[PDB]
């Protein structure tokens, strides 16, 4: 039989026809956000994972620090933090025994309005909210891989440290959240630099924790810094909270990672021959830089010598300046993501179905085709009873071997 698959392209949809017994179509389970997010937080806190509830951990603490993400990495801190302070208050901790510290890493300080954006005005008024000061860190150890862990003094000073943030697939750390709120967020330039170098390894990839060297280094540095407790928001593709996990910085994170996996990880027997990947329509395919995200997910599942068919309009062009310059071999996140594309092209072919014309499409080293069918029908010929994987929401769907 012949299967007929709508693939979103730009602000509409194309179609492809594939022999069903030759292809698998992997879909995400993109769950909708909970109706009462702040109540899901409190539910989470009452049912913590791998560790006692806060009610039993904090009695007598006088210097509690809550880590939150900065304006750059939008997290629902304003949803997570108020229920946390409610438990801290309930357990006898005054608001003057509580501080919020923003994990800037390299980024600039926040204005006051940005701070109120992050935690809510009510929290900002009753609790001190401090930016990471990257020049005021204190050394607490060195990891097995040689990262010196140097932590902002205000976090160093604390007798209790709660880490909050998002928990999603991450292209290098495997997943965000857990100890990542601390390393690199509230660490010195030496710490960020040395940990950042681990992202260039073959084990730093989405959906991988054990044997991911960046994530293992993060969790090791966070242990040297004695993170006591996490509260993490598991986010859907619309960045809405679908679940909160609280408790042990490892066990609560692992349970959050399985909720993410149920939504977006899709385990395949083996790497397939042809991967047909849509970005899921505009604006996920608004430019090639953004479309690289579906392509990154898709290239863990293409065989050496395989063919990717990337269905992405790229209405507004190649995207971020560094990524584009690298891709056009002009005469640092963007540059890496472009080299990621180049490495895949050494292993496989990539067809680009886009608004680009043939000259430009082949300048940047993709195959050209006017439709997804034309690209498939062409490369289906170059393979022998091929396995064909179809990702209609490649930007959020991670095939995994
Ligand atoms: Cl326990
Ligand atoms: Cl961009």
How close is the Cα of 340 to the center of ligand 1, in Å? 42
Chain centroid to Cα 328, Å, comes to 27
Closest CA to 389 of 25, 9, 8: 25
**What is the spatial distance between Cα 254 and Cα 220, in angstroms, rounded to a whole number?**
15
Enter the tokens of residue 124: 């900002």
263 C-alpha to center of ligand 1: Å? 28
Ligand nearest the Cα atom of residue 292: 2
Inter-CA distances, 339 with 200, 298, 332, Å: 11, 16, 11
Ligand nearest to the CA of 319: 2
- What are the φ and ψ backbone dihedral angles of 40, each rounded to 5 degrees? -65, -35
Report in angstroms the alpha-carbon separations of 97 from 7, 100, 116.
53, 11, 19
How crowded is residue 204: how many other Cβ atoms within 10 Å of its Cβ?
21
CB of 101 within 8 A of CB of 65?
Answer: yes
Cα distance between residue 221 and residue 242, in whole Å: 28
Resolution limit in angstroms? 2.2
Interval between CA 243 and ligand 1 midpoint (Å): 21
Residues 6+ apart with CB under 8 A from 284: 290, 291, 293, 294, 395
Give me ligand 2 centre to Cα 88, in Å. Answer: 40
Residues 6 or more apart in contact with residue 197 via CB below 8 angstroms: none
Which residue do the tokens 């860190």 mark? 137
How far away, in angstroms, is 289 Cα from ligand 2 center? 6
C-beta of residue 24 within 8 angstroms of C-beta of residue 397: no
Phi, psi of 144 (to 5 degrees): -55, -35
- The CA distances from residue 202 to 85, 173, 186, 199, 340, in Å, are 40, 12, 26, 8, 11
| CA of 228 relative to ligand 1 center, distance in Å | 13
For the chain, give the number of residues.
401
334 alpha carbon – ligand 2 mean position (Å):
9
Q: According to the entry, how was the structure determined?
A: X-ray
Ligand in closest contact with the CA of 50: 1
Contacts of 107 (CB under 8 A, 6+ apart): 70, 71, 72
Q: Considering every ligand atom shown, identify the ligand nearest to the alpha carbon of residue 57 and give its number.
A: 1
Token readout for 294 is 């579906």
What distance in angstroms lies between residue 51's CA and the mean position of ligand 1's atoms? Answer: 4
DSSP H helices, 299-357, are: 321-327, 333-347
Q: What angle do CA 387, 312, 367 make, to 5 degrees?
A: 65
Sign of CA dihedral 351, 28, 261, 218: positive
Distance in angstroms (rounded) separating the CA atoms of residues 394 and 401: 16
Determine the 3-state secondary structure of 248 from DSSP.
Answer: coil
**DSSP assigned state of 382:** G
- Report the alpha-carbon distance of residue 92 to residue 70 in Å, rounded: 28
Q: Using only C-alpha atoms, what is the Rg of the chain?
A: 23
> Quick one: DSSP state of residue 56?
H
- If we measure between CA atoms, which residue out of 252, 260, 249 comes closest to residue 220? 249
Contacts for 356 with CB less than 8 Å, ≥ 6 apart: 314
Task: Please name the residue that has the structure tokens 């073959």.
Answer: 202
* End-to-end CA separation in angstroms for the chain: 27
**Residue of 342, 337, 341, 272 whose CA lies nearest to 307:** 272
Instruction: Name the 3-class secondary structure at 364.
Output: coil
The SS3 assignment for 261 reads helix
* Residue 57 alpha carbon to ligand 1 centre in Å: 11
**Token pair of 188 as six digits:** 């010195």
Distance 86 CA to ligand 2 centre (A): 39
* Closest to 93 measured CA to CA, from 67, 117, 58, 121: 58
Ligand that comes closest to the CA of residue 48: 1
- Tell me the CA distances in angstroms from 244 to 38, 46, 85, one per residue in order: 9, 11, 16
- 291's enclosing H/E stretch is helix 288-298
Angle at 358 between CA 372 and CA 4, to 5 degrees: 5
DSSP per residue, 117-142:
HHH-HHHHHHSEEEE--TTSEEEEEE
CA of 283 to the centre of ligand 2 (A): 11
Distance CA 255, CA 24 (A): 28
3-state secondary structure of 269: coil
Helix (H) or strand (E) holding 43: helix 37-46
Distance of CA 260 to the CA centre of its chain: 10
Interval between CA 57 and ligand 2 midpoint (Å): 43
Structure tokens belonging to residue 94? 């005054």
Q: What is the DSSP letter of 294?
A: H
Identify the nearest ligand to the CA of 287 by its number: 2
Q: Which ligand number lies closest to the CA of residue 324?
A: 2
Q: Which two tokens stand for residue 144?
A: 């097995």
Q: Which of 126, 154, 159 lies closest to 60 in space, CA to CA?
A: 159
Q: How far is the CA of 236 from the centre of ligand 2 (A)?
A: 21
For residue 81, how far is its CA from the centre of ligand 1 (angstroms)?
23
- Ligand 2 geometric centre to CA of 72 (Å): 14
Question: Read out DSSP for 168-232?
Answer: -EETTTEE--GGGGTTTTTB-HHHHHHHHGGGGSTT--TT--TT-HHHHHHHHHHHHTT--EEEE
Helices (H), 299-390: 321-327, 333-347, 358-363, 372-379
Question: What distance in angstroms lies between residue 319's CA and the mean position of ligand 2's atoms?
Answer: 5
Long-range contacts of residues 112-116, Cβ cutoff 8 Å, at least 24 apart: 114/71
Rounded to 5 degrees, what angle do the CA atoms 194, 65, 177 make? 50
Of the listed ligands, the closest to the CA of 333 is 2
Ligand 1 centre distance from Cα of residue 226 (Å): 17
- Nearest Cα to Cα of residue 318 among 347, 292, 351: 292
């Amino acid at each position: 039989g012949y299967k007929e698959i709508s693939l979103k392209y730009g602000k509409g949809a194309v179609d492809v026809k594939i022999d069903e017994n030759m292809c698998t179509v992997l879909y995400p389970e993109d769950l909708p956000g909970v109706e009462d997010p702040m109540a899901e937080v409190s539910r989470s806190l009452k049912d913590p994972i791998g560790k006692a509830p806060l009610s039993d951990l904090v009695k007598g603490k006088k210097d509690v620090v809550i880590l939150a993400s900065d304006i750059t990495r939008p997290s629902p801190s304003h949803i997570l933090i108020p229920p946390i302070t409610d438990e801290l208050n309930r357990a006898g901790i005054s608001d003057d025994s509580i501080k919020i510290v923003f994990g800037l890493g390299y980024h600039r300080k926040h204005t006051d309005d940005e701070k109120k954006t992050l935690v809510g005005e009510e929290v900002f008024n009753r609790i001190k909210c401090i930016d990471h000061d990257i020049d005021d860190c204190v050394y607490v150890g060195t990891t097995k891989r040689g990262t010196p862990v140097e932590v902002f003094r205000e976090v160093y000073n604390a007798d209790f440290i709660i880490a909050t943030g998002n928990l999603e697939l991450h292209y290098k750390a495997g997943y965000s959240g857990g100890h990542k709120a601390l390393l690199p967020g509230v660490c010195s330039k030496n710490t960020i630099e040395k940990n950042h170098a681990l992202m260039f390894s073959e084990g730093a990839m989405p959906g991988k924790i054990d044997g991911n060297p960046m994530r293992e280094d993060i969790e090791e540095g966070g242990k040297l810094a004695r993170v006591d407790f996490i509260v993490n928001a598991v986010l859907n593709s619309h960045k809405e909270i679908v679940k909160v996990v609280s408790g042990d910085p490892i066990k609560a994170h692992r349970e959050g990672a399985k909720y993410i996996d149920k939504m977006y990880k899709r385990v395949i027997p083996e790497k397939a021959d042809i991967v047909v990947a849509s970005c899921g329509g505009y604006p996920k395919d608004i430019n090639l830089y953004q479309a690289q995200k579906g392509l990154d997910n898709a290239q863990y599942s293409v065989k050496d010598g395989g063919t990717i068919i990337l269905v992405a309009e790229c209405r507004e062009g190649l995207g971020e300046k560094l990524f584009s310059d690298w891709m056009v071999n002009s005469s640092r996140l963007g540059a890496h993501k472009a080299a990621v594309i180049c490495e895949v092209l050494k292993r496989a072919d990539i067809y680009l179905i886009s608004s680009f014309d043939r000259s430009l499409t082949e300048k940047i080293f993709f195959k050209y085709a006017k439709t997804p069918q034309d690209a498939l029908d062409e490369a289906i010929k170059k393979y022998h009873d091929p396995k064909i994987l179809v990702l209609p929401y490649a930007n959020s769907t991670l095939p995994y071997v």
